[PDB]
Design a protein around this ligand. Structure first.
Ligand SMILES: Nc1ncnc2c1ncn2[C@@H]1O[C@H](COP(=O)(O)OP(=O)(O)O)[C@@H](O)[C@H]1O
Ligand SMILES: Nc1ncnc2c1ncn2[C@@H]1O[C@H](COP(=O)(O)OP(=O)(O)O)[C@@H](O)[C@H]1O
Ligand SMILES: Nc1ncnc2c1ncn2[C@@H]1O[C@H](COP(=O)(O)OP(=O)(O)O)[C@@H](O)[C@H]1O
Ligand SMILES: Nc1ncnc2c1ncn2[C@@H]1O[C@H](COP(=O)(O)OP(=O)(O)O)[C@@H](O)[C@H]1O
Ligand SMILES: Nc1ncnc2c1ncn2[C@@H]1O[C@H](COP(=O)(O)OP(=O)(O)O)[C@@H](O)[C@H]1O
Ligand SMILES: [Ca+2]
Ligand SMILES: [Ca+2]
Ligand SMILES: [Ca+2]
Ligand SMILES: [Ca+2]
Ligand SMILES: [Ca+2]
Lengths: 367, 367, 367, 367, 367
């Protein structure tokens, strides 16, 4: 059976092809002790173990904005995934990996070299995340908006054909929203600075943040009463209360100037991607906006996207946002479907054709 | 076998590693005759012999506030410990010594030079007292409050890692409480002035003093009736009676302004040490307050610490004070466990590496 | 004429706009008697009077890390500043106040409410300290590194435009270095514990501490000879000698792990702030590193910053550290220039627009 | 007008507030006949009358070491003071009384009960003797060394604030020196045994004893020649000659081991009191050593104290001993100043607040 | 062999060291003829010869109250002791002499000068009588009450250390009791006036006097019946009868006011000496009251001392009076033990060190 490993900037989603859910979901973090040991303990911790000991660790993400920046730490995470989480021998399982579009070419070349020389997989494949999200929705046409921890990207697909010139990629996703929430939480006197405290702010974001339908009207409501304020208990028992920060943090997705970026929000980027496509397919793309990734899980984000794109598109077009309840795992679920197709069993990069072409084989066999 | 010698400001606790109790416990005192001998007697007396002849001696503690101030007298005490109490040859026993944190560096350097050049030990090691107390409790996480005769100090440890920036040290312990009891005993007309009479007041403190749960409510009870008053027979048959002095003396631990100190009490110091630690480990520290040392042996001190820290900590935190019945010997018991570990046998400072680095070897091998 | 009051965590710098130096510079401290008065004396002392009577006082800083934590004590300091130091009526002087960036919003709201309701100023304004430092240097472009007693912060400014997303703030400044010096002075047997003795250590720091160009090479020099050791006479005539503590204390600015912080040093933070800025302005920022505040007054800190940033920046960039000799008062001097500009006279928050908008007016009129 | 009564162990100093000298100075003695009356005389004699009839009386001091041990005899002395010496009605005069610090609490409680119930004073107050000595010197800062007939005590005061934890009390004063002189006078064959003869030795002490600057060098001078020997005529015409006894008797103040005491001399005790004070006030205490009491009236004691403290203090400190010529009455003179202050008229313990609180009112109204 | 000469006020006890009893015991008297010789006899008689011819002699004691008042007569007694009683050459025997404590310094200086220049002893030593009594009892701890013919003195010794400040000396002993018995014998009409008749009264005292357990109850018994009356035959055959004089004479030891002295009795003096000692040794002193000297030989004096001290001491203390049957010679027996110790042979004052230091050598070599 094939292995499906979705190495996100934030989480590792790993499992076996054919299943309906990832078997192993854990943070893509490596932690190392920052204090001195006095009781006569490992050199580093990975995943959930690093998350539970984060009080005495410095946490490092080896993947930033979909790009692997620390290959020694990324090998620790893959090793932890295969041997400790899946408890499997990689030498007998074809491994399907994922990647954001418009990534550096050396990224997937080094992924290929490590899978074939360090883990000795029989075959591997690198798919594009947004394409897998369309497999999970059971569609062959649609513009996918995938937003994870590192990258937000749009990929328009029509009848199984990608329009690569219309692919959009924005280096603004969950981790940037977490950093922004940390910044605006200082307005109320709350100081989160360490990498461990960043994990606390991320949990605050996932529980209390939501997308306002009308941002300026929501800002007036939060300034007139405390009906929007909610409380959250920190790990040490302290209770913090946040008001408009709940919807100001996800508003960065629609107004990237909040964090100093010049790019347009995800609604304009989606519309700009559709407008780069041929005029005869735009109507089908307007009706099949597929959202995937953890950053699309904010309450109200589908209604806001619906409202924003409707204002940009012609009035006669039917705008439909497809937001499945399980869209946090759409990339893995789509990869599980793809790796189980009988038509896909010819698409694997085998060890034989890697030995005669080097790691550059991945560029002429994977989109 | 290894020797474990806990040189406290008040008592010497010495024994062999692997045992469950110190073999030799005696006062860390040197006494010299202050009168003229007329019957044709030693130049000085050490330990229990000085305590039994204290009527004609001036008693001197060579260790004050965990710092050895008289090295000639300290050598007499170590000599008495090895040859008279343990009856052992130090040249064939690795010796584990203890020290309070944040001590002067010359203190443990001169300890190393004396052990290697005067007693010619094969190896030695200087541990921190609070760390050894955590070994004795069988824990790897907790904030240790060790209070002996000289020093009260807090050391937070999480998963075997010390947080040195959160270590607190207060030069207020048993000997300061004894001096304060001597002062407030003059309110009833009892005058203790000599060093021998200070030993009598110390015995009064250990037998009659206790910690009040509510100090101001206890002061009103002692002022309304004599139900709190207790009697004590002096060595010469005189009987003294003390009332609120029983709980006013240990109250100095929680209100150091009684003796003119500006520092906060041991409850606030414990809380300040926890608040200096990372927020993700505070909950485990709140549940693992370990008390050790003779000054934590007052009846009611665990209930008072529980009450005081609960008022400082958030209401959802579970405050648990660990006060073992044998906590007066926790430092020695922990040192006996550490010196018996197979993983510790590489941590000794051997005579070979001392001959090539001098006494400064102790700073890069001992915490 | 306008009043310029720079309320630092450590010092109050106050004076009149148009002058070239603050008229009143005194410690931002409130002292209260901790002993019992027996001679038939005020309830509290402020500023220089508290510093001269500190032997019998407990000293409190109302501002910690640029945040006012005791508003009753802060009102005493402002009252002392206006009526006793400047000897002025605040009801007839617009008051320019300063603040660190990324402060809690309630801080400058309560500053506005006190200035308008307690002191009844006609107008006020809250400026950012680093921006004022750029006014003092006569520049419109540069990255300001301001480090006082409470906060170290970087603000990059290009052609008069701030890049707020690149603003960095580190809660590590002079007071943390003083606390660290107090800790490592115990290595030589010197014990400073009281708030009054902390003022002695601060004076030791300002006179003997310096920044080593190469820290590890300086540590080897101090360990081989006593050429680096210097003496200092305490107020009671005792003489202390310190060696490597002279440069170990300021080294915390470049290695915050000395005090248990995870953040990067001030050189990496400066470089990270420049790298967050647009690529077209980085060359001008590299050539205009402006240092201000008392914590940048260590001998050798400009040469060390020059060396550290040069190692981080590309080799073709010209790194220039601007360290004026009067940079301890740059914030006040810049505020004196700003409050005297004819273009600034429209920027004041007047009492009229405060009466119709409440203290929240300060957020939409002050950066 | 207020009455100022300084009840010393040796002398009663009584007078009216506002005066510059006590009106009544007489010995605090009660004498009773020890022989049989044959001529057909009182039951007891008080003060100067007991001193003139001491040949046929047994003399008793009701105050020993500042503690009233015979309350029936002490009432006789107070009665003699009010009605026979001052010739006044105590029911119309507030009475200021004095006491040594660290006295039993029952001492000043019974003083309060007798003044309010036996003599029916309208108001009373119990001051500390050393504090009054500082009033007499016109100072608000200084360490007072008061040594009378019963108690030697040090009280450091800074800016009107006492440091109670630094108060030192030594039960070694004039009466112990008299007893020691009686003992060493037997070396020359002179035998004084009765209580009446003790009064003769006291007069010898006050006339011939002095403090040697260098004791061992003075002992060699007295052993080589008779230049130090002086004569004294006893009441019966016999002439005695004393040599080194002149300076051996006051040397007990600096070497209390002469009379079997373990405590340090008055110079070390003064230095130990200063060293218990905060480091920032020690320089002012070194320059303001105030001496008071009859036992500081030995010729050369200020030069000896100056020499001894200079050897203990750092070389850069300026040691200044303040020894007024009228320092034998400093306690009374200071009490006369205090009782005449307009600010003190609220400090009296009135009869009204004594009737509602009992004699325990004196503890919460008097230091 | 060494000579041990105990020169008491009443008797000379002389012998050789190592023996268990003095070889020569005779009265310390010199008699001279007071009538005219008519038969054609010495100029003076010494010792037993003076006692047998006392009818025609005037008897003189050269020692009064332990002080040699007639040095020409004392030389006659020493000459009689060496040549007539011991029949020995003093030039070949080290001589141990005794003395009461608190004696004039010239007394033992002139003893040293006479022994070295008149008798030319090779070495000599002056011991304290009470210390020798403790040697005789085989103890190293105890308070010795030695009462001879001239002096009653208490010396507390603990573990071989004397407490000189607690030494008590009372110039009331056997000779004062003899004089008092002579006075109260006139109540019955018996007149003894001459020095020879004083020797008769002394013999009456030694045979008939005893100490009453309860004095006032014994006085009532003697006044109701004649059961206490005893008879005594004078040398001329006359028979005298005495009643309450038997116990009134020794009662002066417990009530010195009988002879006009102000001092306390021997029981209070013993208790006052113990109370001057450190509190930790009082229990051992209470259990080791050693009595010595001829004046402690009255029947019932140990039971009376036991009863009197028990009433003064705390009820939990065990009072034990050690009264050996041979305690009349305890000083000599102890001196015989001391002079025979091998450790004492370095303590002698030799003729060599006397020739270089003069008679003042005795003060820095003898206690
Ligand atoms: N309920 C939620 N609301 C908002 N954000 C969420 C929620 N759940 C997860 N996220 C965010 O989604 C991001 C990563 O999710 P995921 O789609 O797995 O991306 P990746 O594949 O990069 O790990 C994280 O930054 C996380 O904060
Ligand atoms: N039962 C008790 N109650 C109160 N204090 C005690 C008790 N037992 C011992 N102590 C105090 O503990 C102090 C020293 O104990 P210890 O922990 O051995 O410290 P150290 O290691 O410094 O000798 C002494 O000052 C003693 O007075
Ligand atoms: N010469 C110096 N060397 C090192 N530090 C100094 C020097 N002078 C002042 N400082 C430090 O600067 C800090 C505060 O200076 P300042 O810039 O006025 O800050 P603030 O505005 O917070 O008062 C103090 O902590 C002080 O110790
Ligand atoms: N000139 C002097 N020299 C030495 N001692 C003196 C002199 N005058 C008085 N004294 C001593 O001072 C003591 C008491 O003086 P005082 O200060 O009045 O004390 P108190 O208040 O206890 O009576 C007496 O013991 C006396 O012997
Ligand atoms: N049995 C006795 N009862 C009472 N007193 C006695 C007795 N025997 C001797 N004494 C008295 O003891 C005194 C001297 O005895 P001793 O101890 O030898 O003293 P010293 O050494 O002064 O001669 C004499 O005064 C004598 O009266
Ligand atoms: Ca993803
Ligand atoms: Ca200890
Ligand atoms: Ca500042
Ligand atoms: Ca006095
Ligand atoms: Ca005798």
């Amino acid at each position: 059976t094939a292995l499906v490993c979705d190495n996100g900037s934030g989480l590792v989603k790993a499992g076996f092809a054919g299943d309906d859910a990832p078997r192993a979901v854990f943070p893509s973090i490596v932690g190392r002790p920052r204090h001195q040991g006095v009781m006569v303990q490992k050199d580093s911790y990975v995943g959930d173990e690093a998350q539970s000991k984060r009080g005495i660790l410095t946490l490092k993400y080896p993947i930033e904005h979909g790009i692997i920046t620390n290959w020694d730490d990324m090998e620790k995470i893959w090793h932890h995934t295969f041997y400790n989480e899946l408890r499997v021998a990689p030498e007998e399982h074809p491994t399907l990996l994922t990647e954001a579009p418009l990534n550096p070419k050396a990224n997937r070349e080094k992924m290929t070299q490590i899978m074939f020389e360090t883990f000795n997989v029989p075959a591997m494949y690198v798919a594009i995340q947004a394409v897998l999200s369309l497999y999970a929705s059971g569609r062959t046409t649609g513009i996918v908006l995938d937003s994870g921890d590192g990258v937000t990207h749009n990929v328009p697909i029509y009848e199984g054909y990608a329009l690569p010139h219309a692919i959009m990629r924005l280096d603004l996703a969950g981790r940037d929203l977490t950093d922004y929430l940390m910044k605006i939480l200082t307005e109320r006197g709350y100081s989160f600075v360490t990498t461990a405290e960043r994990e606390i702010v991320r949990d605050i974001k996932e529980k209390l943040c939501y997308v306002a339908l009308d941002f300026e009207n929501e800002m007036a409501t939060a300034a007139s009463s405390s009906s929007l304020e909610k409380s959250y208990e920190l790990p040490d028992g302290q209770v913090i209360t946040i008001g408009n920060e709940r919807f100001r943090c996800p508003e960065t997705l629609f107004q990237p100037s909040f964090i100093g970026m010049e790019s347009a929000g995800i609604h304009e980027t989606t519309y700009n991607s559709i407008m780069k496509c041929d005029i005869d397919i735009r109507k089908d793309l307007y009706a099949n906006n597929v959202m995937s990734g953890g950053t699309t899980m904010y309450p109200g984000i589908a209604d806001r996207m619906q409202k924003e794109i409707t204002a940009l598109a012609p009035s006669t077009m039917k705008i439909k946002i497809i937001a499945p309840p399980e869209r946090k795992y759409s990339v893995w679920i789509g990869g599980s479907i793809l790796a189980s197709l009988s038509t896909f069993q010819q698409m694997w990069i085998t060890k034989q054709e890697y030995d005669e072409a080097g790691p550059s084989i991945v560029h002429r066999k994977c989109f």
